[PDB]
């Protein structure tokens, strides 16, 4: 009961051209009749599961103003909450609840790796996380109750924060726009747009977050390169002339060090595998899980033939690249699965916006290596099969 995309009347071409990473946009009834597949009770229970990332924010009624409590929680933590002015946040709910993941199928005009997760929030009256900015692109989907959103169309270059809070709040915030969202309508914000959301009632908000890496975040992911090197080129100086000053790291040494790093980065096939892995890797303490035992190539062939369907558990953790020689590499949850040039055409299909049925898998369904690939992907918990 969801439309193809989340832009309602708007076309993807126009949205990406005029809004994406540029201007805020409010879309009224983008998702008609969309109510939360989960309930505030179920959200709380979900926040009590170990390995899950959840936070309770109390503007008032806590030990001190804007108190933050970190999960995983237990049911005793919820009963002591005031009747008003607090918020429950839960990360990666799309990875915990397939019905929420289906909401992610409404934003496919953006590449999978740009997606982070769907964060679900619940708040009674007056509940808010305060005025703040993110580096995220975000679709703020109203799923229950009403929320008053205030923003400012001018992005924040240098953010002036409030000292020592545990949550990032702006010291000064004057909004030039204000809206009250009902279940179904969506508010898109590009990065660094200051926004202040306040629940008018018992409300839930599904936040579809995108994220793109910066230089520090790429630099910190560089050690993963070593997986494909097994040493690589080593610095050498057989032509070393002796040492005027032994302390000096000469420009000639920096040249070779720069040459060694450039060789890593400039090898596109290498950079493609590295980035594909570190960008699909689970960002938090929640990875996928193997089901039952491996369904053999035979059962997989038959079960799929009898009308079974394959489901993508984590769309944001699925990607691929095509190489120059025609080979491809499929990335799933941080692992790299190499595809021969013949088998390479499956990568778009598996990571695509299509349904994975016997009909769509027909050509490769005979090939043994393809069945072996689906085995290992189901094994690692990247794909789940479901009968009709």
């Amino acid at each position: 009961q969801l439309p193809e995309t989340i832009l309602g009347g708007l076309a993807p071409e126009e949205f990406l051209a005029n809004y994406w990473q540029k201007r805020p946009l409010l879309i009224r009834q983008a998702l008609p009749g969309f109510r939360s597949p989960i309930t505030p009770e179920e959200l709380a229970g979900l926040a009590c599961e170990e390995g899950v990332t959840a936070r309770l924010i109390l503007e008032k009624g806590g030990a001190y103003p804007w108190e933050v409590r970190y999960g995983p929680f237990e049911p005793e933590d919820f009963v002591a909450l005031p009747p008003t002015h607090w918020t429950l946040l839960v990360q990666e709910v799309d990875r915990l609840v397939p019905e929420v993941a289906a909401l992610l199928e409404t934003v496919r005009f953006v590449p999978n790796w740009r997606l982070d997760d769907i964060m679900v929030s619940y708040a009674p009256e007056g509940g808010t996380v305060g005025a703040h900015i993110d580096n995220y692109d975000v679709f703020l989907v109203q799923a229950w109750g009403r929320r008053r959103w205030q923003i400012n169309h001018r992005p924040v270059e240098r953010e002036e924060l409030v000292p020592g809070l545990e949550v990032r709040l702006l010291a000064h915030f004057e909004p030039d726009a204000e809206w009250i969202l009902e279940p179904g309508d969506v508010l898109y914000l590009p990065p660094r747009i200051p926004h202040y959301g306040v629940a008018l009632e018992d409300c839930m908000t599904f936040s579809i977050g995108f994220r793109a890496p910066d230089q520090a975040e790429l630099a910190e992911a560089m050690p993963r390169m070593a997986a494909w090197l097994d040493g690589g080129r080593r610095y050498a100086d057989p032509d070393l002339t002796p040492a005027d000053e032994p302390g000096e790291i000469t420009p000639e040494a920096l040249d070779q060090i720069q040459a060694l790093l450039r060789a890593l980065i400039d090898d596109r096939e290498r950079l493609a595998r590295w980035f594909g892995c570190i960008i699909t890797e689970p960002r938090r303490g929640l990875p996928p899980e193997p089901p039952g035992r491996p369904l053999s190539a035979k059962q997989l062939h038959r079960r799929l033939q009898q009308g079974a369907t394959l489901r993508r558990n984590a769309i944001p953790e699925l990607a691929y690249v095509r190489h120059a020689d025609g080979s491809a590499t499929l990335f799933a949850s941080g692992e790299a699965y190499e595809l021969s040039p013949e088998l390479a055409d499956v990568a778009p299909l598996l990571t695509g916006r299509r349904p994975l049925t016997a009909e769509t898998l027909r050509p490769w369904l005979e090939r043994d290596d393809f069945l072996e690939l689906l085995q290992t992907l189901i094994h690692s918990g990247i794909l789940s099969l479901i009968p009709a």
Partner: peptide, 8 residues
């Protein structure tokens, strides 16, 4: 001072 939407 962790960013708000980033979570962990």
């Amino acid at each position: 001072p962790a960013e708000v939407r980033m979570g962990k």
